[PDB]
């Protein structure tokens, strides 16, 4: 399998051992936009603009 690359923003999550476990692309969906705005993976309930 081959896929192209580009310069884009990504969110990284490091555990207590320094291993990447989760990641989300901020330019994929609106939930990913909310996650990158809150810099987390389980944002609180609210109305995000």
């Amino acid at each position: 399998w081959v896929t192209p690359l580009s310069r884009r923003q990504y969110l990284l999550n490091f555990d207590e051992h320094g291993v990447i476990t989760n990641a989300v692309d901020c330019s994929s969906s609106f939930l990913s936009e909310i996650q990158c705005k809150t810099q987390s993976f389980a944002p609180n309930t609210g109305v995000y603009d």
Binding site: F30, L31, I34, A42, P43, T45, G46, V47, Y48, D49
Partner: protein, 616 residues
């Protein structure tokens, strides 16, 4: 530039017709932009005129040379999207305010959404139209009385209405049924409690204007010395905010300690109950032997759930040098100039003042009750609401048990889900967020090559270093100005709240005011005061009926001889063919006398005539 006839045909293109109704990029003889065209009929274009401008210098029209037609230029839509997301959900709901679903699905969206419908606010995506159902509280408020609710298993989101308040309904009449009205009078009652928190202070924040900017570098200090003082304006604002906080605390202490006198024979270890009412959970220590802590058990339970208190900051700052782990953010903030100072008065002194104010309304000479004993004052304040004195004199142990149960309930309610602690933790989190933002402000480039002065001083020349440090200095000074403006805006509201706090302390606790619907909710009886983190806690006792009955009452009667009688805080009932009097808050028939009836000298029109009342 970009206007005229002399053009460069290096990048040549073919001429295209002018399209109307779509937002496209146009190159009209050098005029470049983006907008929508519209064919109109304009006759103001002369021979030497081909463009239409406004007062701001924007093209809003033109006339083509090849085809003498007129058009208007208007930009297309540009807005944002409002999304409501729950705690754990797959995808959040969408709402395009003031836009139809057709326009969204045809112009700004290219995803085939299965759920879509129009509303009063706009097109709603990923939701169900259930406006026929109403709720009392919802965390996703959209406006105009609509809010989105989440239901765990179509789509889990629902579009319902919002109605947080409603009135109580009865099955009585709204007319005069046979000359008498139909109203309900309570037959049984109890005592209920209610807590309330009012913020009276805020953490005193002090910022070192010479440490936040130019921490330890000498060239940075020499460059900052060229901007004048630029730090005295911040220091004066911080000092005046601290002075306002100190004046507020002193005024609160004076209001708590205004005109109070006790006896020199109390010990708080043997005299802690009156009329079988337990008050041990609302008293500290007053006597000879007592430790460094004088907080009541309620204050202890309140302070044990908050970490950032008057002593918490002191302990956190003590645990910065040496120790085991210095990973706390408070030490990092203190190492940059941001530090919190303790208030002028300790919490133990406020707790002692509150204990003295509470005792002043519990033992002779009853300073906080104008010289009236506690049970007598309670009976008077209950009678003032329309309750006969007989049922109060007969039911005293019941009132004591109700007070004890209310105290136990208000003490146990703070364990699982309190209400006063929410405001305290919200204030703490707001202060922490402000401090974290002010700290993270130092990690911005502000147009420079880096946000660290060490790299700039170890990589570039002194002139380049100055050029790169100037922008950082300006940005940090702007941030400090914004922060002190925010601090002023917050201290104004803190003063506004402390004013009402002092007013309620003076008019609801240490005295009984005739102001109805001010301390409680119309049936207020007694209010107490307790010490709380960054404020005070009030315990409001009220009169709460439990049972009711339907009776027929009369507004007023007229006796023989064109005389009239009018009741005060009561009504006239009829039993066994006899007119009597009853209270407005308790059903207890009693003979008609002169101490509860207003005498008149005129017979009204709609008053019931009864020449059988033998009253002088």
């Amino acid at each position: 530039i970009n206007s005229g006839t002399t053009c460069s045909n290096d990048l040549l293109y073919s001429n295209t017709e002018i399209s109307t109704g779509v937002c496209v990029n146009y190159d009209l003889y050098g005029i470049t932009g983006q907008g929508i065209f519209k064919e109109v009929s304009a006759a103001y274009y002369n021979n030497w005129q081909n463009l239409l401008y406004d007062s701001n210098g924007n093209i809003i029209g033109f006339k083509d040379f090849l085809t003498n037609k007129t058009y208007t230029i208007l930009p297309c839509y540009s807005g944002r999207v409002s999304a409501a997301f729950y705690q754990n959900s797959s995808s959040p709901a969408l709402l395009y305010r003031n836009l139809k679903c057709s326009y969204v699905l045809n112009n700004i969206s290219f995803i085939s959404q299965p759920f879509y419908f129009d509303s009063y606010l706009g097109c709603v995506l990923n939701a169900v139209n259930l406006t026929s159902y109403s709720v009392s509280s919802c965390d996703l408020r959209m406006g105009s009385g609509f809010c989105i609710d989440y239901a765990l298993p179509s789509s889990p989101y629902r579009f319902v209405t919002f109605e947080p308040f409603n009135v109580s309904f009865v099955n009585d009449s709204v007319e005069t049924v046979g000359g008498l009205f139909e109203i309900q009078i309570p037959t049984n009652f109890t005592i209920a409690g209610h807590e309330e928190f009012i913020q009276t202070s805020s953490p005193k924040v002090t910022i070192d204007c010479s440490a936040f900017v130019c921490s330890n570098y000498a060239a940075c200090h020499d460059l900052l010395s060229e901007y004048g003082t630029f730090c005295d304006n911040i220091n004066s604002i911080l000092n005046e905010v601290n002075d306002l906080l100190d004046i507020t605390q002193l005024q609160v202490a004076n209001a708590l300690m205004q005109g109070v006198t006790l006896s020199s024979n109390l010990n708080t270890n043997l005299h802690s109950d009156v009329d079988n009412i337990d008050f041990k959970s609302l008293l500290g220590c007053l006597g000879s032997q007592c430790g460094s802590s004088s907080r009541s058990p309620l204050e202890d339970l309140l302070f044990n759930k908050v970490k950032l208190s008057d002593v918490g900051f002191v302990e956190a700052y003590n645990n910065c040098t040496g120790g085991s782990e210095i990973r706390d953010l408070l030490c990092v903030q203190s190492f940059n100039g941001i530090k919190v100072l303790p208030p002028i008065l300790s919490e133990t002194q406020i707790s002692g003042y509150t204990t003295a104010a509470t005792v002043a309304a519990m033992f002779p000479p009853w300073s906080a009750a104008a010289g009236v004993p506690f049970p007598l004052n309670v009976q008077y304040r209950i009678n003032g609401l329309g309750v006969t004195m007989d049922v109060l004199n007969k039911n005293q142990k019941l009132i004591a048990n109700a007070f004890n149960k209310a105290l136990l309930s208000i003490q146990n309610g703070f364990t699982a889900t309190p209400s006063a602690l929410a405001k305290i933790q919200s204030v703490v989190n707001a202060n922490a967020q402000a401090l974290n933002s002010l700290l993270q402000q130092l990690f911005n480039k502000f147009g420079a090559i880096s946000s660290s002065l060490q790299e700039i001083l170890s990589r570039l020349d002194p002139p380049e270093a100055q050029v790169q440090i100037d922008r950082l200095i300006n940005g940090r000074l702007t941030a400090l100005n914004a922060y002190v403006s925010q601090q002023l805006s917050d201290i104004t509201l803190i003063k506004a709240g402390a004013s009402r706090a002092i007013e309620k302390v003076n008019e609801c606790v240490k005295s009984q005011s005739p102001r109805i619907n001010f301390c409680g909710n119309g049936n207020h009886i007694l209010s107490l005061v307790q010490n709380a983190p960054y404020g005070l806690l009030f315990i409001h006792f009220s009169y709460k009926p439990t049972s009711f009955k339907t009776v027929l009452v009369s507004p007023g009667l007229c006796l023989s001889g064109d005389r009239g009688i009018a009741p005060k805080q009561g009504y006239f009932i009829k039993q066994n063919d006899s007119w009597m009097f009853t209270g407005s808050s308790y059903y207890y028939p009693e003979p008609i006398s002169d101490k509860n009836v207003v005498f008149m000298n005129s017979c009204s029109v709609n008053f019931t005539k009864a020449p059988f009342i033998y009253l002088n």
